[PDB]
Amino acid sequence: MGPSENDPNLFVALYDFVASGDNTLSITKGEKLRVLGYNHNGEWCEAQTKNGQGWVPSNYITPVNSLEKHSWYHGPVSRNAAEYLLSSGINGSFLVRESESSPGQRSISLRYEGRVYHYRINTASDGKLYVSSESRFNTLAELVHHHSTVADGLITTLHYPAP
């Protein structure tokens, strides 16, 4: 009843936002939200709470379980900075990055044999994530475990970090 405590899409309101009509969602400071998607520049979020669904400014809310906590998820990184981060490493070294504009456009950057390969992570109609079209997953963590076991689309497997 409500999102799971560790849901990556669980957000908390940093400030109160008061809705203008519908399509905007009123939220209070301290109140939890579940974010579904961002507008074109990532500045507005389609949120959902115990009161309904609608857009909210992304700068009035903050992640409760940021994916940045895993070493391989890096947050906003350009295609070129990701190549700098991967200018050393063995085959399979990798990173998931967000576009600087929309946090919804992710890529995987992967080192294989001295050069870096870049792959868009697609979100399907239902929300399933995938890189290859028949291998779709619910969570990003599941996509990277699958692509660590088997390449299946990529040039080589992902190297899952030792702990």
Side-chain angles (χ1 to χ4, degrees):
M1 286 314 138
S4 169
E5 48 169 36
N6 282 293
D7 182 341
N9 283 113
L10 188 62
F11 279 61
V12 72
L14 281 171
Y15 306 89
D16 308 345
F17 176 62
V18 179
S20 43
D22 203 355
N23 277 285
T24 32
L25 175 76
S26 303
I27 52 167
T28 300
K29 199 181 157 49
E31 188 184 7
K32 311 296 172 298
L33 316 74
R34 171 170 203 241
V35 174
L36 309 177
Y38 295 94
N39 73 331
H40 71 281
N41 48 352
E43 293 192 4
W44 279 71
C45 286
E46 195 174 23
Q48 182 174 269
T49 70
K50 294 164 204 293
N51 300 326
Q53 181 172 131
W55 297 91
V56 139
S58 57
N59 60 187
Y60 281 55
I61 61 168
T62 187
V64 175
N65 307 100
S66 180
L67 284 165
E68 279 187 60
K69 65 180 160 191
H70 307 115
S71 60
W72 53 260
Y73 191 86
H74 285 235
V77 173
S78 59
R79 179 209 242 233
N80 295 320
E83 296 226 339
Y84 171 81
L85 295 171
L86 294 174
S87 41
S88 66
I90 63 165
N91 297 173
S93 306
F94 86 92
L95 143 187
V96 175
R97 53 192 178 78
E98 293 162 17
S99 190
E100 315 216 79
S101 36
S102 195
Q105 193 189 91
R106 280 75 159 262
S107 293
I108 287 179
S109 295
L110 169 72
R111 178 166 260 210
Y112 174 72
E113 216 66 53
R115 37 187 282 142
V116 174
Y117 293 87
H118 294 272
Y119 298 90
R120 220 125 212 98
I121 281 175
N122 306 99
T123 310
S125 26
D126 47 17
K128 276 174 161 291
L129 277 59
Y130 68 93
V131 172
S132 294
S133 193
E134 253 101 287
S135 314
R136 303 193 181 197
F137 306 97
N138 226 100
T139 161
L140 240 182
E142 234 204 283
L143 189 161
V144 328
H145 291 156
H146 179 71
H147 282 296
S148 292
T149 316
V150 266
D152 183 42
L154 311 188
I155 189 149
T156 195
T157 30
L158 264 33
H159 178 71
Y160 195 60

